[PDB]
Design an enzyme around this catalytic site. Structure first.
Site, PDB file in Angstrom:
ATOM      1  N   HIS A 128       0.852  -1.190   0.000  1.00 40.04           N
ATOM      2  CA  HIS A 128       0.000   0.000   0.000  1.00 40.04           C
ATOM      3  C   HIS A 128       0.895   1.249   0.000  1.00 40.04           C
ATOM      4  O   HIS A 128       2.061   1.206   0.394  1.00 40.04           O
ATOM      5  CB  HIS A 128      -0.887   0.067   1.244  1.00 40.04           C
ATOM      6  CG  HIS A 128      -1.850  -1.052   1.460  1.00 40.04           C
ATOM      7  ND1 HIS A 128      -2.824  -1.366   0.542  1.00 40.04           N
ATOM      8  CD2 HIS A 128      -1.979  -1.923   2.488  1.00 40.04           C
ATOM      9  CE1 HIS A 128      -3.536  -2.378   0.977  1.00 40.04           C
ATOM     10  NE2 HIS A 128      -3.056  -2.735   2.175  1.00 40.04           N
ATOM     11  N   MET A 141      -9.726   1.762  -2.956  1.00 34.15           N
ATOM     12  CA  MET A 141      -8.960   2.113  -1.742  1.00 34.15           C
ATOM     13  C   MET A 141      -8.619   3.600  -1.778  1.00 34.15           C
ATOM     14  O   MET A 141      -7.549   4.014  -2.224  1.00 34.15           O
ATOM     15  CB  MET A 141      -7.714   1.262  -1.588  1.00 34.15           C
ATOM     16  CG  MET A 141      -7.131   1.355  -0.179  1.00 34.15           C
ATOM     17  SD  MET A 141      -5.844   0.155   0.145  1.00 34.15           S
ATOM     18  CE  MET A 141      -5.241   0.718   1.733  1.00 34.15           C
ATOM     19  N   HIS A 149      -4.159   0.120  -5.454  1.00 33.88           N
ATOM     20  CA  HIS A 149      -5.501  -0.330  -5.160  1.00 33.88           C
ATOM     21  C   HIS A 149      -6.551   0.717  -5.444  1.00 33.88           C
ATOM     22  O   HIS A 149      -7.693   0.595  -5.014  1.00 33.88           O
ATOM     23  CB  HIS A 149      -5.591  -0.748  -3.665  1.00 33.88           C
ATOM     24  CG  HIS A 149      -4.689  -1.921  -3.390  1.00 33.88           C
ATOM     25  ND1 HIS A 149      -3.807  -1.944  -2.352  1.00 33.88           N
ATOM     26  CD2 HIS A 149      -4.547  -3.106  -4.056  1.00 33.88           C
ATOM     27  CE1 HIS A 149      -3.155  -3.104  -2.370  1.00 33.88           C
ATOM     28  NE2 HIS A 149      -3.568  -3.828  -3.408  1.00 33.88           N
TER      29      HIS A 149
END
Ligand code: CU
Length: 99
Positions: free
Chosen positions: A37, A92, A87
């Site tokens: 991430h 996200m 993402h």
């Protein structure tokens, strides 16, 4: 405030995903699960006069282990949209209001 990157089940969410902070309060993004991430701010959706390059992670810097953090402090009042680059198509994305 602390924001988790990913639910424990690997769900592709910031937790919390829509929140408020005071100007000058630190935001701690903590990598949780479902990584890699990162955290990038959308330069079209933040307050005027803010440079998204100062508050966003570097493009090649991804958080790839549990518990790694990215810390940032926002001062200009207003609403800021940010997302996780890998993402972003999966939803996200998050929003922080600074007051
Ligand atoms: Cu992500």
């Amino acid at each position: 405030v602390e924001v988790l990157l990913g639910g424990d089940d690997g769900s592709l969410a910031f937790l919390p995903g829509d929140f408020s902070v005071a100007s000058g309060e630190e935001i701690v993004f903590k990598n949780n699960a479902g990584f890699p991430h990162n955290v990038v701010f959308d330069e079209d959706e933040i307050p005027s006069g803010v440079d998204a390059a100062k508050i966003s992670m570097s493009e090649e810097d991804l958080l790839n282990a549990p518990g790694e953090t990215y810390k940032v402090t926002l001062t200009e009042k207003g609403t800021y949209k940010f997302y996780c680059s890998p993402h972003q198509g999966a939803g996200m994305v998050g929003k922080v209001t600074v007051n």
